């Protein structure tokens, strides 16, 4: 009674193959990104490595979700889906731009992911619901290191954060538009995803030190 398309339908499994691949790839990239962040911030290596390892654990849970639905994920699709943000992350990393890397991974992707997971939970099959609930719980019981680091260093980071937001937030809108059709087959509405993302991202920007007016301008950039 949860979805208009049956979990066993080829329509559902086909859409799932791409959305599942996106979540798996996102988690794979989070693992690698956090390990690379530890190069830039060696003083916080233990915490960043712990986060990396947690995201690798999450990746394996989402792989189990695809297996349970008898779906082979389309990993090349997912790799293309993330190419823009992934490329921007790697370029910033190569220039030692920790602030930009953190905005992309710890703020933008983290908010996008939690949005996706929370909208998926109510429409997920019983097995995948439990896995996703566990992932969401983990994100809630662990400190968002990147957010806290940016908050501690806000005054010096502010200018770059504004610049990184302008360059990267429009890629989120692009991603959401790309994903909309498949997400709808899974019972996940674009409006709900956008809402969840803007609340999460906006709250993070507020915690870090941006004003209500600044967040308005920022969280709606390129939309």
Author numbering: 6 to 228
Quote the study's own text.
The variants of cADO-1593 from Synechococcus elongatus PCC7942 and cADO-sll0208 from Synechocystis sp. PCC6803 were constructed, overexpressed, purified and kinetically characterized. However, there is only one hydrogen bond between Asn123 and Tyr145 in 1593, and the corresponding residues forming the other hydrogen bond in sll0208 and PMT1231 are Gln49 and Phe150 in 1593. Thr159 of PMT1231 and the equivalent one (Thr146) of sll0208 are also involved in the hydrogen-bonding network close to the di-iron center. We have observed that 1593 is more active than sll0208 against n-hexadecanal, so Thr146, Leu148 and Tyr150 of sll0208 were respectively mutated into the counterparts of 1593 - Leu, Arg and Phe. Since PMT1231 is more active than sll0208 towards n-hexadecanal under our assay conditions (unpublished results), Asp49 and Asn123 of sll0208 were mutated into the corresponding residues of PMT1231 - His and His respectively. cat values of sll0208L148R and sll0208D49H/N123H were increased by 70.5 ± 5.3% and 65.9 ± 4.4% respectively, whereas those of sll0208D49H, sll0208N123H and sll0208T146L were significantly reduced. Firstly, the results of 1593L146T, 1593F150Y, sll0208T146L and sll0208L148R have clearly demonstrated that the side chains of the residues consisting of the oligopeptide (residues 144 to 150 for 1593) whose conformation changed in the absence of the di-iron center had important effects on cADO activity. Unexpectedly, the Y150F substitution of sll0208, in which the hydrogen bond between Tyr150 and Asp49 is removed, had negligible effect on the catalytic activity. The triple mutant 1593Q49H/F150Y/N123H showed higher activity than WT 1593, 1593Q49H/F150Y and 1593F150Y, and the double mutant sll0208D49H/N123H exhibited improved activity than WT sll0208, sll0208D49H and sll0208N123H. Thus, some synergistic effects were observed for 1593Q49H/F150Y/N123H and sll0208D49H/N123H, implying that these two hydrogen bonds are beneficial for cADO activity and the co-existence of two His in both hydrogen bonds is more important than the presence of only one His.
